[PDB]
Structures are given as C-alpha cells and as structure tokens.
Design a protein around this ligand. Structure first.
Ligand SMILES: Nc1ncnc2c1ncn2[C@@H]1O[C@H](COP(=O)(O)OS(=O)(=O)O)[C@@H](O)[C@H]1O
Ligand SMILES: Nc1ncnc2c1ncn2[C@@H]1O[C@H](COP(=O)(O)OS(=O)(=O)O)[C@@H](O)[C@H]1O
Lengths: 381, 402
C-alpha cells in the first residue's frame, strides 16, 4: 500500500489517556474560540489528512505553501502543500495571549478541543494570500468571504495536540473515516490498488463513466482487486450548491442502481472545507487522498473550478488542473488518471467523451443520471 | 572553483559563426514576429544563459510550473528555481499568420532578424491569473504589467530559441554588459574564492554600501582571502519615473571613485533583465540568474524588488518576505543568502547604520521622491547618506528633467 508523506501518518490526537491531562492543562492557558471552519481544519489536521504538518502553519510554512505549493522536511524532502491551513486571530486575542507559548483551542460548546504548543503570531497578508491561492482577487469568492475577508489580521501557528476525535453529530459521523481507518478498510479487502474520486457534486453518468472506465484500465493493467474510493467533500461548501446530507443520499441511490459497484466501492466523507481554487486546490485534493492510501487519482476537467463571481467566464482553464497535477511537487509517486470531458451523446443514448469532430452530437436527458439518483435530487429541490 | 550554473553547464542559445550566415537566410524565409523592446531584452537574457537551463520561451508546461511552483523540473527529476514567466505574447492576427509553421523568426525593431524559435507551441494567455500568481495582486498601475501584459496578445508562443547574433545596443554601455561566461572568466582571473553579488535597481547610497562592506568583512572573517563584489545593476526595462540606467551608471562610477566601495575588489556589470517589481517572487529570479553568473553569495535586504501599491498606500509586499522566501526557495538551497535588515541614517552617529527599534526617533528615511524634492529645493540629504560625488551626479540628473 502507498505510504503517507514523510513515511508515516502523523496523527495529532492525544493518547488514551492524556485526554484528561490535556483537558486539565488547557484550563491554565489562554483561550481561542474556534469557528465552524477552524474546527474542520482541526479535524483535518487531527486525522493526518495534511501529513506531516504538525499543526496550524507557522510563517515559514505559510510562505512555502503560497509560493511553491510545497513543504520542505528534515531531509531535503519536499511534499505537496497547496493550501494555507491557518488560524486567523484579531487584535484583542493577540494581546490576550501576550507571551504565552501554549494556547488552548475551544469549540463553540465551550469545551477544550486542542492545545497549540510553541506558538508564533505573524501578519495576515490577505490580498496576497488570496491572489496567490485563487489566482484572482474578485469579491464573491465563497471560501474567502468566510474565514478570510472579514476577520483576523494575524495568524497563529504551532504544534497541535488534539484532545478528542471530532464528531459533528449530524447523523453522518459513520461516514467520516480517518486515513488510518481507510487504510484499515483497503487492507481489509486485499486491495492491490485504490483509485480515489474527489467530488463536491451529485454523481451523474459522466462521473460514473470516468470511474467505470478506470476499473477496466486497472483490471487490464493486471490488478485483481481494484477498489474505488468514492469521496464526497463534506467540509464547508458554498451555500448555493447541494448540501452534503442530500448528496450522500444521492450517492446512495447511484450505488443502488448498479451504476457503481458497492462490492468494490468504499464510500467515505472528506472532512476538508472546499476552497474552490482550481488547479491550486486540486493538488490538495490529491495530497490528502495519498495520505488516505489511494495510489490512483481520477481527475477530469476544471477540477475544483467555479465561475468567476463577476465576469462571464470560468476562473480557470479547464485543462490546467490535469496538467498542474501531473507535475506537482510531492505528487509524482501518485498515479494520475486524467480524463477529457464527458457529456451526453445524442447519437448513442449515453454519456461518452466529447468528440470535437462532431460537436453537434452533445448536450451539456435519459441516461444522464440514474433515475434513482435523480429522485433524491428532484425531492431535495 | 566557482559555483555551478544549475543543471550543470551554462546553456547559451547563440548560434556559432559557422551557422550564422545560414541562419539569417533561414530566418528571412519564416513567418516573422516583431519584438518589443522588452521581448528583445528577454531574448538577450535567454541567449547568454541567464535562465539556464531554459531552452527558449516557455512552453505551457514550463509556464504553469513557474506560476504555481516557482520551479522547473529537469529530465533527471531534479528541480531548479524559475519564479518569473519568460514568455512571448502574440495577437490573433500573428497567430493566424503563423498558421501551422513549426518555426518562426523573431525580428527586432526594425527589420533585422535576431532569432529563430523552433518547434513552437501556441497556447492561451490567461493574463489575470498570470498577474495574480506572479505579483500577489491585481491592480491597475503595476508598471511591468501595464508595459507588456495588459495590452498584449491573448496567446503565448514557446520553443527552442536560436539567437543569430549576440545582442548589442551600441549605446556606450555595451562594455558593461558582461555575459555570465565573461563574468565567470573575470572572477577566475582575480582568483576569487568568494563572489558576493549585489542586485540593485537604484542609485547607490551609503546604506547599500554598508551591506556590501559588512559582507566583505564577514567573508574575510570566514577565511576567504580574495572576496569579489559583483555590483550588478539591472539594465532592462524599469519604470520611467526611476533614475535611468545611464545616470545610475554615472552615479555608481562616482561611488567607486570616492572609495565608498573598492574599485580594486569589485566587478561592475549590467544585468540585462527587465524589472518585474514583484518582490518575493521576482527576487528569486534575481538570485537564480546570479548563480548562473558564478556568484556563490547573494546579498539581500528589506523589501527586495518591491514597490508601493499603486492604488492604495501601503507596500505591495511585507518587507521581510524576500529574505525568508529566498532562504527556502526550490533550487536556491546551494546559494549562500546574506540577509540584512533595514539600514537608515542615524542622526546620532551621523552615518548610515542598521535600524535600532529601541530608539526609532534617531533614524531618517530618505526615499527617491524625497531626494528629488531636496534637489528641487536646493537642499541635500544628511552628510553621509550618500557620497558627495554620487549625489552630485543625481542633482545633475534632476536638473536635466527640467
Ligand atoms: N463533465 C465532466 N467531464 C469530465 N470530468 C468531469 C466532469 N465534471 C466533473 N468532472 C470531474 O469529476 C471530478 C469531480 O468534480 P466535481 O464534483 O464536479 O467538482 S470538484 O470540485 O470535485 O472538482 C473532478 O475530477 C472533475 O474534474
Ligand atoms: N535601506 C535599505 N536597507 C537594507 N537593504 C536595502 C535598503 N534599500 C534597499 N535594500 C536592499 O538593497 C538591494 C537593492 O535594492 P533596490 O536597488 O532599491 O531595489 S531592488 O529591486 O534591486 O531590490 C535589495 O536587496 C534591497 O533589499
């Protein structure tokens, strides 16, 4: 099975039992209250989705991420790191911490979630951080409006100890498998290959085509036990799009109508918030999937893309995600599976790859989505 | 020995004498692109191996690596620094005229064939995304951007560049335009054991001099017996309100003449790159080109390659980021970075010295605008901020603008 970055998973949840010891130690330190998205990053960090990141990003790590989309290690080593994972902090909170080297991170219930050790506070260069991550500045960037635009002229990083595994209690916690649980589950099936499929949307037959086509390629490649890791992203997503709970139902119906084989598919939820930062973000979608133990990564067109909040176009070129991914630092050992655009073929009755020689044949609808999956979606709506 | 050009060997793109005549003829047959002043500067940069091991104008693959990773991957799987796009933009017409030719000729202004671009590929030119990832911002009034990007074509052409003749301007400064090979040959003649480079775009004041003389001191203390300063003013495109290259050279020559810097242990040469004004991103490029010139030490201060935000007034960049970003940049690890903090005029010592935050009221900051204001007002900066000869050249430059 493919090894995590650095050689081992770096999980940051304290042992059983220092949880009481750490709950108590937290009572003597200053307090920062997490917002919803902060806690999701804590959740991300805890399970080791950003291995070997030892906590919220210090200044040198933040800069490395912005400029190079990578992190250097104790050897000359470079791993992929394409998104700032940062805790923002306002003026009153900075003073309130003063000269403390340990701060405590509390959830909105008022309980101690985590201890941040050996902290450093530094400036929050908002415009530049945004320009370097999204490749634009325009207002209306959903992730930017949350957690960046409005609050925090400082950042605080350091080594993080997470007290208790994060549970949202929304009724979906049984889907949120850790990287090491997924590795427990792939090794459970004697999987000789794991192909991941990142998605933020409901599955249609185009997405299925990419997945079904990947199977045969791996069987034709010699693999006896290929496993599809279907991975809806379940962190923050824009209010517009279809919420996680409905998508999970939709996927349940897709897996039901045989369009995807449940016998060889693991469904799990990726805890990370969505950046909507195109080629920059897709590297992170891939980075995590490596740490989750997937050695093949499916990428289609315009991954993690969206329309420009102002102008009449897409933020990004649709082919760049593929291209950038296939040369991204620390992602070389990952097997990339690039695909072209799938749309509805009118000559045939199904989804098929777009044929530039006969554009008149494609619509962008019977066979476009499995009618079971369309029930969830027509209900929800 | 001197530090290696990265990839191993310098990669020059100038054809040999033998093939020279042949190439011009082959060039006159090809579809042709007329080079802007800045395009020609990049051709110069490419020709002499300043961007070694880059084989010409960037292909789409090389363009993306530059924007996202600030590095190029080599065929052995190693990387080298590459933080600024070196590209060639063309419009719908030019594209259409090129058609399906795989070879195109680059012509100067006016009429002369300067290069052939081989095995070309034309790809989309995403200007906004390009400006954001390179400059850290989008804002009207970024000078390099306004000069070659915002009015440029929606396409880029890359390929293998063959430069027919070594570029000369014949402006009375060609004797200072040393190639990296020529620079390496001069360092070796001096038996230098340490080559410390000072990139600059501005007139030399005594703050810059402090950086350079402290460096020589550190190097001597480290054990080096013949440390050599590469005083290396940038000479390609700069914004027009800046002091032009020819005045800066006269100013630099006065600084060496007054003994502020030592003419015997200094090489003075002009760096032919255009100026990006892109701080932490651009500064990597300033360093990478210097490795290729054989400098194994690189001096860097506060806000390298920076400028004020054009629209609002704060700096474009955090002044400490250049040093940091340089110290961890891919492919620059083998270069010795020599970081400095702010130098400023110390009223209490009557000298340029390193800024002391515990007594900030002691320090005077003198900007280019202030210098121009003083000159108009018939006054001078404090005694010791700039050597008299250098300052005199500047008052003459200010007077010429009248
Ligand atoms: N019509 C399509 N044709 C080919 N690939 C697609 C198509 N739509 C989405 N994809 C790919 O399917 C994967 C999932 O994308 P989405 O769920 O729509 O959003 S994304 O943010 O996760 O990229 C991505 O790899 C994307 O590139
Ligand atoms: N007052 C200063 N104190 C310390 N370093 C400085 C100072 N002014 C400029 N520098 C440094 O001197 C070098 C050249 O500066 P400039 O000529 O103004 O512009 S630059 O584009 O070449 O960086 C850079 O390393 C810069 O950081």
């Amino acid at each position: 099975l493919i090894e995590p970055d650095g050689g081992k998973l770096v999980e940051l949840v304290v042992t059983d039992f220092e949880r009481d010891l750490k709950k108590g130690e937290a009572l003597s330190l200053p307090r920062i209250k997490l917002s919803r998205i902060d806690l999701e990053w804590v959740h991300v960090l805890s399970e080791g989705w950003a291995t070997p990141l030892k906590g919220f990003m210090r200044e040198a790590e933040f800069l490395q991420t912005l400029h190079f989309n990578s992190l250097r290690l104790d050897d000359g080593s470079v791993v992929n790191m394409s998104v700032p994972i940062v805790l923002a902090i306002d003026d009153a909170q900075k003073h309130r911490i003063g000269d403390n080297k340990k701060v405590a991170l509390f959830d909105s219930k008022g309980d101690p979630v985590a201890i941040l050790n050996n902290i450093e506070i530094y400036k929050h260069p908002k415009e530049e951080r945004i320009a370097r991550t999204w490749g634009t500045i325009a207002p209306g960037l959903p992730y930017v409006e949350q957690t960046i635009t409005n609050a925090g002229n400082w950042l605080i990083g350091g080594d993080l100890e997470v007290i208790e595994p994060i549970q949202y209690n929304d009724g979906l916690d049984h889907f949120r498998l850790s990287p090491t649980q997924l590795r427990a589950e792939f090794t459970r099936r004697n999987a000789d290959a794991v192909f991941a499929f990142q998605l933020r949307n409901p599955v249609h037959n185009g997405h299925a085509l990419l997945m079904t086509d990947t199977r045969k390629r791996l069987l034709e490649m010699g693999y006896k036990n290929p496993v599809l890791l279907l991975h809806p992203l379940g962190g923050y997503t824009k209010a517009d799009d279809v919420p996680l709970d409905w998508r999970m139902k939709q996927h349940e119906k897709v897996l039901e109508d045989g369009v995807l084989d449940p016998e060889t598919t693991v469904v799990s939820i990726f805890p990370s918030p969505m950046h909507y930062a195109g080629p920059t973000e897709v590297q992170w979608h891939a980075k995590a999937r490596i740490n989750a133990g997937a050695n093949f990564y499916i990428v289609g067109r315009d991954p993690a893309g969206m329309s420009h909040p102002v102008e009449k176009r897409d933020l990004y070129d649709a082919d760049h995600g593929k291209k950038v991914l296939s040369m991204a630092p620390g992602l070389e050992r990952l097997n990339i599976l690039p695909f072209r655009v799938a749309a509805y073929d009118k000559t045939q009755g199904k989804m098929a790859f777009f044929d530039p020689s006969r554009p008149q044949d494609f619509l962008f609808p019977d066979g476009f989505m499995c009618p079971g999956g369309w029930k969830v979606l027509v209900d929800y709506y």
